[PDB]
C-alpha cells in the first residue's frame, strides 16, 4: 500500500505545516502537524476543556463506530518549547491520503496549553519520531508509520515541504520526479528516539564550505534551523546590522537587508537553503526588526534540522530494519 496527502503552511511565514488525517467512522478529518521529532498521535476532542478550544477542529469519539477506549491509557507531553497537552486513549482507524491503520491509538485531549489553543489552525499533531518517544501509559503506543510499515510497498514516508506553497507527504513510496538529481543516504542513530544525523558542515552564502561533524534532528515540527553558537554566529556575521538580542531570543535583523543562502552537506552532497527562507518577518507588527530562522542550539542540547532546512530539499525516512536518511535537491 502507499499513501500521499498535500501539506499546507498555517501561515505566511511557514511556521508550520498541517495535512488532513481521517480518523472514526464515519471519518472525522482534522488537520494535523506532521511531526518527525514526537511520537504521539493527539488530538483536540471532544473531551478537551472549552475554554481550552477556540476554532479548531474537534475528534468525537463517541459519534466514531469503531473508536474503542483504550482503558486505563494516559498521555502527557511537554514539548522544548513550554507546550503542553495531556488526555485519555482511544483506539480507532486513522487514514492518510488513501493509507489507512485500524486500531491507531489515538490520544484524546483533556488539556491543552495556551500555545495550542491559540493556534486556530492545528488540530493536533501526528508524531512520526520512533515509538520509544511516545508518551501513553502505562503501555507505549506505536506511531501511525511504525502501525502502517508492514503494509507499505516500501517501509519509507517522505517529506516535501514547500517555501510558501504546499508539499507533500508520502508513504510506501519514493516519487522519483519530486526531485533533481540523486538522492544521498546518511546514518541514523535512534538511541535518542529521532531521526538523528550528522551533518557533514556547512557554508554560508557563496563562502568556502567548513567540513565539520554536526550531530542533529530532522524534523518537521520544528519551525526553524538551531544549529552551534559558532555555526550561527558565522552565518549571521555576512549579514550588515544583524545580532543577537536576549530580549526578543534570537538574531534578529533588518528587515531591509538581503540574507545570504545557508548550505549544509549530507555525505558529499550539499543542500542549499536560499537567503529568503531565513527571513521569519517583523519581531512585532509594524517592526523594522526581522527575526532569524537560524538561531542558536545552545541550551536547547541538541541541533535541530527544523522545517527552514527540510523544505529545501525532498527527505526520506527510511524505516528499514536499520533507519537511514535521504536528502535530494528539488
Partial sequence: STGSATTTPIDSLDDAYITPVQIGTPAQTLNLDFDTGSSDLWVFSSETTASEVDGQTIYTPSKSTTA?????ATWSISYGDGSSSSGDVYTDTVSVGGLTVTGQAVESAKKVSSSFTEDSTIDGLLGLAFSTLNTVSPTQQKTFFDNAKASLDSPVFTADLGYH????????????????????????????????????????????????????????????????????????????????????????????????????????????IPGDYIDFGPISTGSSSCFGGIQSSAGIGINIFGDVALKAAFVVFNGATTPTLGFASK
Fill in 68 to 72: 474503542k477506549l483504550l482503558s486505563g
Fill in 165 to 272: 506553497a504546499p508539499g507533500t507527504y508520502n508513504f510506501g513510496f519514493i516519487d522519483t520526479t519530486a526531485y533533481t538529481g540523486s538522492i544521498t543516504y546518511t546514518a541514523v542513530s535512534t538511541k535518542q528516539g529521532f531521526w538523528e544525523w550528522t551533518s557533514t558542515g556547512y557554508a554560508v552564502g557563496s563562502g568556502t564550505f567548513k567540513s565539520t561533524s554536526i550531530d542533529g534532528i530532522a524534523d518537521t515540527g520544528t519551525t526553524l534551523l538551531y544549529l552551534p553558537a559558532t555555526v550561527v554566529s558565522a552565518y549571521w556575521a555576512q549579514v550588515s546590522g544583524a545580532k543577537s538580542s536576549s530580549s526578543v531570543g534570537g538574531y534578529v535583523f533588518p528587515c531591509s537587508a538581503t540574507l545570504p543562502s545557508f548550505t549544509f552537506g549530507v555525505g558529499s552532497a550539499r543542500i542549499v
